[PDB]
Amino acid sequence: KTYQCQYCEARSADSSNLKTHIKTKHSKEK
Ligand SMILES: [Zn+2]
């Protein structure tokens, strides 16, 4: 149904959104 981060266990319904999340909460990818 949703997409969950490919680093942690976060869940989003869009892509741009999840990427944003990574940029600041992981700051390693992509
Ligand atoms: Zn994450």
Tab-separated table of C-alpha atoms and ligand atoms in Angstrom:
chain	number	residue	atom	x	y	z
A	1	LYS	CA	0.000	0.000	0.000
A	2	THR	CA	2.755	2.424	1.078
A	3	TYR	CA	6.518	2.713	0.548
A	4	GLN	CA	8.696	2.414	3.668
A	5	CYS	CA	12.227	3.901	3.873
A	6	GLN	CA	15.071	1.713	2.566
A	7	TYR	CA	17.280	2.615	5.556
A	8	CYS	CA	14.978	2.871	8.602
A	9	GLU	CA	11.347	1.885	9.203
A	10	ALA	CA	9.522	5.071	8.111
A	11	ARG	CA	6.377	4.983	5.902
A	12	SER	CA	5.297	7.418	3.130
A	13	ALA	CA	2.691	7.402	0.314
A	14	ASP	CA	4.785	9.430	-2.176
A	15	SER	CA	8.419	9.293	-3.434
A	16	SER	CA	9.637	12.949	-3.301
A	17	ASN	CA	8.418	12.888	0.311
A	18	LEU	CA	10.434	9.797	1.362
A	19	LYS	CA	13.558	11.123	-0.400
A	20	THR	CA	13.208	14.418	1.562
A	21	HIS	CA	12.969	12.348	4.776
A	22	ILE	CA	16.260	10.555	3.917
A	23	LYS	CA	18.106	13.837	3.036
A	24	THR	CA	17.683	15.070	6.652
A	25	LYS	CA	17.157	11.936	8.861
A	26	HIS	CA	19.905	9.792	7.222
A	27	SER	CA	21.862	12.303	5.123
A	28	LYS	CA	23.800	9.471	3.396
A	29	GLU	CA	21.634	8.676	0.362
A	30	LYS	CA	20.650	8.935	-2.406
B	1	ZN	ZN	14.425	6.551	6.932
